[PDB]
Amino acid sequence: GIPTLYTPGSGQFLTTDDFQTPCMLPKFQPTPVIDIPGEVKNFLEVVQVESLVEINNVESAEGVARYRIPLNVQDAMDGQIMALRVDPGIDGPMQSTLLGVFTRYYAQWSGSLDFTFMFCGTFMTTGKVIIAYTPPGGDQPTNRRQAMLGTHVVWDFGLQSSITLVVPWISSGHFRGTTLENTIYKYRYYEAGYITMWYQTNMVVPPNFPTTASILMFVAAQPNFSLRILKDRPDISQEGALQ
Amino acid sequence: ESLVEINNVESAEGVARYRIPLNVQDAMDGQIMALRVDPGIDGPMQSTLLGVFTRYYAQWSGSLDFTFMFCGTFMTTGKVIIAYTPPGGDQPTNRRQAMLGTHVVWDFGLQSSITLVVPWISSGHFRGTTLENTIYKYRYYEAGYITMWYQTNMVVPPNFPTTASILMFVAAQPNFSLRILKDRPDISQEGALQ
Amino acid sequence: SDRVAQLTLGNSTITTQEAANIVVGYGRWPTSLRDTDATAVDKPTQPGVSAERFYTLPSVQWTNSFKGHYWKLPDALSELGLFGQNLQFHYLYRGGWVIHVQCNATKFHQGTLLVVATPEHKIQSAESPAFARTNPGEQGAAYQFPFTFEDGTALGNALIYPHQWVNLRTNNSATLVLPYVNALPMDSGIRHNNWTLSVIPIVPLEYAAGATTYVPITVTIAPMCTEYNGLRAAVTQ
Amino acid sequence: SDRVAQLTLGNSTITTQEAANIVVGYGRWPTSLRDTDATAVDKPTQPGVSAERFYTLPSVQWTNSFKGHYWKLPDALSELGLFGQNLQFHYLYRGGWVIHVQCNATKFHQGTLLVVATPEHKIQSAESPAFARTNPGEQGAAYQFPFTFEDGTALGNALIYPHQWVNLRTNNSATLVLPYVNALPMDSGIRHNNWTLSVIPIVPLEYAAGATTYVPITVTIAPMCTEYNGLRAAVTQ
Amino acid sequence: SDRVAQLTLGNSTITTQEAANIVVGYGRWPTSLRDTDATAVDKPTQPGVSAERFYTLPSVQWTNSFKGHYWKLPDALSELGLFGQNLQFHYLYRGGWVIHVQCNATKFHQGTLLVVATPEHKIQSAESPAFARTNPGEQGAAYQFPFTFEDGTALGNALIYPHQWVNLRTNNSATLVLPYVNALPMDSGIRHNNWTLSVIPIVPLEYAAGATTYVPITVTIAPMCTEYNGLRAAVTQ
Amino acid sequence: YTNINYYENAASNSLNKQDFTQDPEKFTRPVVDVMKEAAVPLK
Amino acid sequence: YTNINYYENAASNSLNKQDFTQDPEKFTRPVVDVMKEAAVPLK
Amino acid sequence: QVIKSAVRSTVENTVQSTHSITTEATPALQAAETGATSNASDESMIETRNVVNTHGVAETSLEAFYGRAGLVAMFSTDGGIYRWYINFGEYVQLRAKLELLTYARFDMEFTIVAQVVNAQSKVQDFNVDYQVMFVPPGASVPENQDSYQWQSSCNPSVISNTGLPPARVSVPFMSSANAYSFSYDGYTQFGDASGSSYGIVPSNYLGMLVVRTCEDLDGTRLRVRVYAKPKHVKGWIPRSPRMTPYKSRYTGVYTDTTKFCANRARITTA
Amino acid sequence: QVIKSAVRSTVENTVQSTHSITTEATPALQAAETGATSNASDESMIETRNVVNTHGVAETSLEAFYGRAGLVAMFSTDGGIYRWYINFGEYVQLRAKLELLTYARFDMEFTIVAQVVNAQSKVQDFNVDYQVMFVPPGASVPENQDSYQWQSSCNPSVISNTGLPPARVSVPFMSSANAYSFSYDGYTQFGDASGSSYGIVPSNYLGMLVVRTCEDLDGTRLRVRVYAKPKHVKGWIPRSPRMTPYKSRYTGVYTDTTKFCANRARITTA
Ligand SMILES: CCCCCCCCCCCCC/C=C\[C@H](O)[C@H](N)CO
Ligand SMILES: CCCCCCCCCCCCC/C=C\[C@H](O)[C@H](N)CO
Ligand SMILES: N[C@@H](CCC(=O)O)C(=O)O
Ligand SMILES: N[C@@H](CCC(=O)O)C(=O)O
Ligand SMILES: [K+]
Ligand SMILES: [K+]
Ligand SMILES: [K+]
Ligand SMILES: [K+]
Ligand SMILES: [K+]
Ligand SMILES: [K+]
DSSP: OOOOOTTTTTTOOOOOOOOOOOOOOTOOOOOOOOOOOOOOOOOTTTTTTOOOOOOOOTTOOGGGGGGGEEOOOSSSSSEEEEEOOOOTSSSTTTTTTHHHHTTTTEEEEEEEEEEEEESSSSSBBEEEEEEEOSSHHHHHHHHHHHHSSSSEEEOSSSSSSEEEEEEOOOOSSSSSOOOOOOOEEEEEEEOOEEEEEEEEOOOOOTTOSSEEEEEEEEEEEEOOOOOEEEEOOOOOOOOOOOO | OOOOOOSTTTTOGGGGGGGGEEESSSSSSSSEEEOOOOSSSSTTTTTTTHHHHTTTTEEOOOEEEEEEESSSTTTOOOOEEEEEEOSSSSOOSSHHHTTTTTTEEEOSSSOOOOEEOOOOSSSSOOOOOOOOTTOOOOGGGGEEEEEEEEEEEOOOOOTOSSEEEEEEEEEOOOEEEEEEOOOOOTTSSSOOOO | OOEEEEEEETTTEEESSSOOEEEEGOOOOOOOOOTTTTTOOOOOOOOGGGGGSOOOOOEEEEOOOOEEEEEEEEGGGTTTTTHHHHHHEEEEEEEEEEEEEOOOOOTTTTEEEEEEEEOOOOSSSSSSOOHHHHHGGGGGGSSSSSSTTTTSOGGGGGGGGEEEEEETTTSSEEEEEEOOOSSSSOOOOTTOEEEEEEEEEEEEEETTTTTTTOOEEEEEEEEEEEEEEEOSSSOOO | OOEEEEEETTTEEESSOOOOOOGGGOOOOOOOOTTTTTTOOOOOOOGGGTTTTTTEEOOOOOOSSOOOEEEEEEGGGSSSHHHHHHHHHEEEEEEEEEEEEEEEOOEEEEEEEEEEEEEEEOSSSSSSSOHEEEEEEEEGGEEEEEETTTTTTTTGGGSSSSSSETTTOOOOOEEEEEEEOOOOSOOOOOTTTTTEEEEEEEOOOOESTTSSSOEEEEEEEEEEEEEEEEEEOOOOO | SSSOEEEOOOOOEEESOOOOOEEEGGGGOOOOOOOOTTOSSSSOOOOOOGSSOOOOOOOOEOOOEEEEEEEETGGGGGHHHHHHHHHHHHEEEEEEEEEEEEEEOOTTEEEEEEEEETTTOOOSSSSOOOOHHHGGGGGOOOOOOOTTTTTTBBBGGGSSSEEEEEEEETTSSEEEEEEOOOOSSOOTTTTTTOOOEEEEEEEEEEEEETSOOEEEEEEEEEEEEEEEEOOOOOOOO | OOOOOOOOGGGGGGOOOOOOOOHHHHHHHHSSSSSOOSSSSSO | OOOOOOOSSSSSOOOOOOOOOEHHHHHOOOBOOOOTSSSSSSO | OOOOOOOBOOOBBBBBOOOOOOOOOOOOOEEEEOOOOOOOOHHHHSSOOBBBOOOOOOOBBHHHHHOOOEEEEEEEEEESSEEOOOOOTEEEEHHHTTEEEEEEEEEEEEEEEEEEEEEOOBOOOOOOOOEEEEETSSSOOOOOOTGGGGOHHHHHHOOOOOOEEEEEEEEOOSSSSSSSSOOOBSSSSSOOOOOBBSSOOGGGOOOEEEEESSSBOOSSSEEEEEEEEEEEEEEEOOOOOBOOOOOSSSSSSOOOOOSSSOSOOOOOOO | OOOOOOSSSBOOBBBOOOEEEEESSTTTTOOOSSSSOOOHHHHSSBBBBOOOOBBOOOOGGGHHHOOOOHHHHHESSSSEEEEEEOOOOOHHHHHHTTEEEEEEEEEEEEEEEEEEEOTOOBBBOOOOOEEEEEEEETTTOOOOTTTTGGOSSOOOOEEETTSSSSSEEEEEOOOSSSESSSSBBBBSSTTTTGGGSSOOOOOGOOOOEEEESSSOOSOEEEEEEEEEEEEEEEEEEEEEBBBBBOSSSSSOOOOOOSSOOOOOOTTOOO
């Protein structure tokens, strides 16, 4: 017998362990690996795909309508269109997106985000809107003047239906927490900032045209985005074994 | 090749269950026999070599060899069509429907036998050996049917037997293989043997 | 001239242990339409094994009053398997055939059948032929005037066309391979029948008293080297 | 990313003067079954131009209450032309697709359609789905729960599947080329639908008062690079 | 696979004009004991032509109630010629066999016999088998349970053992060459029977009315490549 | 470091240690016509 | 991979890892006269 | 095919950019209608600095996401035996993870934890021997604690004790298919147009586990938990993730809803 | 001898064939009377495609079929001792497997599982020391728990505890023969024409196992299960498999039957 000394840890079942174990069917030979389109190797490939943001989360909005940002001919200037926190892993408009479902499977995130907007008004409907990203420090900007002092993009409606607003990674630390749960961990420390939209000029229409039109909101991770520390997705639960 | 207990009917006992019956017709295009080709399910094939071993495993794959030997008198002639119908519906209802599948037309003569290869035609690389449906929904795997019909007729000279017998052989082809060993369901006991 | 054979086309294999060689009409096997003969400019469809296999038709009984029976091609298979589907869906069709006629009796019987394939065999023994005789379907039709071949010629001279005999003492089958024949590169498979296959008894079925008297004749045909042009919706004559 | 296109398959040619590029699912065009993936040992049938062409299905009206409409593949063409014939006659089928969704309005209208092709899109919003919804035929079926995609997922995340949008101000059509996808080398075309094609309105149809209000949505599909195995008689689910 | 044969061993020559090839069990002809397998140290006796020739046993009638008949080896010849003498006088015996089963009828008869040689075929259908059934002598014994092969197995699977068939329409004889099989280099010829030769009817004897009904089955066996050790006085079981 | 197999079948092996990602283009940009970043998409 | 013996007698060794099959001819075709597939068996 | 997939081990760096006043380069202009995701990059939308980014991508690989044990079954014996059908729809966590891929191939590590409990479900410090037998479809299933089937001469069995470390075995990729399917728009058999046979991949069912106590317990029972861990993961065609609750163990049936996230007062208030 | 046996690790491929209209090649024609199995191949009966088949043949090898533990004995002590005769006819599963070969040579792995049970056969959590002694023929067999024979100075013994993992030892190929026989058409001794001495290979009996508890249990007893696993299998002459039930532990005696599979109404209905 070779002298051994077993140590603490022995017998334990760590769900993340990685040992080699005897196979139940030692000589079994699996079917061949055939050619199937669409193979994925890392889930980062999936969060880089744009998916729709449930931005219109208000009482009056039900179903498909919660994906539509509303625009309409103004009779006043510099007005606000929408506002939202850019944090990808907290409850709200972004939790049902691809970026969100996966950010919620992890505890920390890092990277620039891709916010793409597509206009859906008639071909004759024009307009200019300013979209801004306000870095941490205070509250969402109160007027267009305060918003344009941050990172922004002025969007002109035309043949190219969409525009991208990159919310670049600007953080004190290399990573942020995916939740801003405050009462315990004081994680509001990590808030990433706000994204607001305002009328640059106005939405102008010809006679008798619809005076309201819709903007769809897309979101994805940039190529420098990554997640760390897997954890159970909070939205999937049950009260007992399924029948 | 081992013999298939194809004549599994009340009237058939013992050795007689291995005999397919032929007889001089007075009608045309008639049916002689029918069976599921699945080698591991209960029925005519479970007591064969192919079957006993298919029943020791949970999955199978390969072409099957179905060889038939005629045993009528030297003067008894005939032509029969044997067909393999791939999955989709039920066994064919008439010769016309059967011949639209894989078949062989057999002519009686000095060469007493004929082979019908039921080629491996499956969606998946393997099939389950049982078609137990109530739980696993394994009827998903049914491999098809094999039917035999008169191509012409069995003709005999005066005073000869008007019925003769066909023996049915079955074996696996060279591309057949089994996976996942399991206990043969036919071997059991109620307690330690005395 | 061996007496055995195996014919394998597609997913169908046929065998006989008492054949009498194999005939190839005019010494020509089926061939595809050449670029210098073709006129229809569209890329053709070529079904392959789906339509080029053996189709067995319902059997006919060699009765005492039997005069013969005929099938028109491609009419007889105009509704079978994917071959028939392709025939209906296309304006144009071209193709050859492999024919296998079967009839076994015993060494105690005697009889002789002429198995002939005639190019453009007109059924003109009536002033206004009935569609049921010119195009009898898969069941084919019975001969009413076998001596004059249903076309005003001598049955005895029908041997100028591709044929074999089924002489019960010698063979239980006849096998013929036919090429496409027409004064056109292609034609419609529903409006024109290029070949007719007839089985006519020239020496009556006889046998030793008590022998089996129920003797069928089965015909099995296979399209071969076929091609279709002018696709549209399905249409029959 | 040009805005015009012409798609020619077989005897059918399609054109659009307001497209928005062309999507190829998973970056893979349709390919035939390789010898190392294949398991069914019989020589396959390859219909060619007879089944690989464009089939136009009956149009759907973009009404005010419109939630969307879906077609299952190959179910929707399971009874059209020679493609459907081949699907029924064979146990096994394999194939890709070329999809062209059409919907023109005017520069006085506004609306947006999501045109998505989903692999294995289950219609599971009912405990025991009705065959008329899982396999709706050439007429397809209407959406009842577009927000949850009829399968318990978020409509907004359906963009993880191959898709295009028909945004009336930008384009009047969507074009998709889909490869065969399955955990099998081949499968039955009657018992399993590999892809589902849905057209769901995400921004309602609106227009300047008095503009045409009758706006149809036409879907045109083409099988591509198809092959079939296990020939027998015709069978449907 | 010729249909004629002549078998010449010693002073005996056998012929048949309707055979069906010749089977060699397990592909191995009879061979002598090698020096590395042997354990008995005494020089063996090798009778040669005196014991290695054809011995014909009394015939059995293929009656209407006939189930089959079996002979055990070397028991059946344990008392014939010098082969039997040598078997009795030696403690140890080793040897192979050449078996020729005969049964001619006419072209007006039909019937089929399975001719099988089984290694270690136990007659265990009784709790305490009778010596007259386990060792029936030159007359052999009749089958009582042919379907279960007298050993609790399926008759149909007996083809896993060396065999031939005597199908009256095809052949009038079966020929088998068997090698010595045992888990020992040699054994006692009186206490252990290595092979059993059974002739079981699977298709009953039938014929045209009036044909000869008295049909015998004759079995002719020849020891081959035999050797004996442990000489003493004669002893039987 | 040590990665050596003790058991017969590969199913007994420990987790794969090749954890990388690949270009998401087949998912993010499955289009036929190239649309460079510097250009306008629709032309 | 590792296959090294610890014990003295070969009966202690693990299962053989040479799981192949061989031609079944000695069982499926133990005849003296060759009968090619393309030929007729009885001539 | 047309689109190639390069491989990398770190996220992309950021390189320094400068201002731009031009009419030739408009990276911010996109067209979502094409089906493509925007390709406007950081460097093109703002003036950036150089950042050598070494953040890795390992924990989001299929193997790092799936490679850990998760509960798939929990039960107690009734008469010293229990038969469980191997299917992962009982517990939702691991189920919701697997359904993120359409097709996938993987080996598995099964860990079995057992302990004895009395009638009031209070754990007992009792070491008893237990047997776990895998019975493939078509094999005779044990009717009770001492039926002949537990001889297990062909069926794989594992015998351990509630006082020994948990039992564990590896399992190969066993389907007849070339990958397991987690979404199936089809039927289980031909000639069945019934909703009860829709959406089930029969080849995903490989049998059942039958558990027993080698000898009878007097008044107590075996409490068992089966954990399963995917290994060597290969997957194809990512799917839209589950956004509504599971109701049935065997199907994806669900209850429609009108919103996913909770509402807020105004769209202009963050 | 005349017929050679080539070796292979995968089943045969399928190569593309074409049509055939000829009188020289008739592969479909066979003659079962010869004793040969048909040799008509796939490629000759239909038009096939190319299929590179890589399906393996490993799990059907003798070693993969036989190489796993199976129950061969089960018993309880009576007075703290029990004598079992080493023979595998008590339990039918492993027995029916071995009888698929006529002769075979193999080593064996014996695993012994023991536990204490009370008079009502309810398992006890009691760790007691037990001894298993192999007594070859001709050696003095222990009469009871404390006889002198348990000194075991020559006979092999294994001593373990019901609280320790199961005991296990390997055993060599021990017969006096050159292979074990699973069918024997002969008698056990010369000068015996009695049915009670027919069909038993005495060299297949190598003794007995005598089990005891090193010290007496008060009111309880040792419950033992012996598993056996063949290793390094070599076999000759495959046999027709068992198709009827076993009745006796020591012989193949059986009850005749008129059918094997259940009947159906018509031979023409599948
Ligand atoms: C002896 C120890 C027990 C070993 C148990 C081995 C069982 C074989 C594992 C099969 C794993 C396949 C699971 C695949 C898919 C899931 O069931 C799906 N949720 C069903 O739709
Ligand atoms: C000390 C641990 C116990 C080790 C026991 C060693 C016993 C020797 C093993 C002999 C195995 C031979 C079995 C061979 C044949 C079977 O008994 C047959 N069924 C009897 O006909
Ligand atoms: N098969 C055994 C019981 C199995 C066990 O309890 O381990 C018998 O019937 O006696
Ligand atoms: N041989 C010892 C008893 C053996 C034992 O109990 O271990 C004696 O006679 O005292
Ligand atoms: K980097
Ligand atoms: K751009
Ligand atoms: K991006
Ligand atoms: K191979
Ligand atoms: K042959
Ligand atoms: K074969």
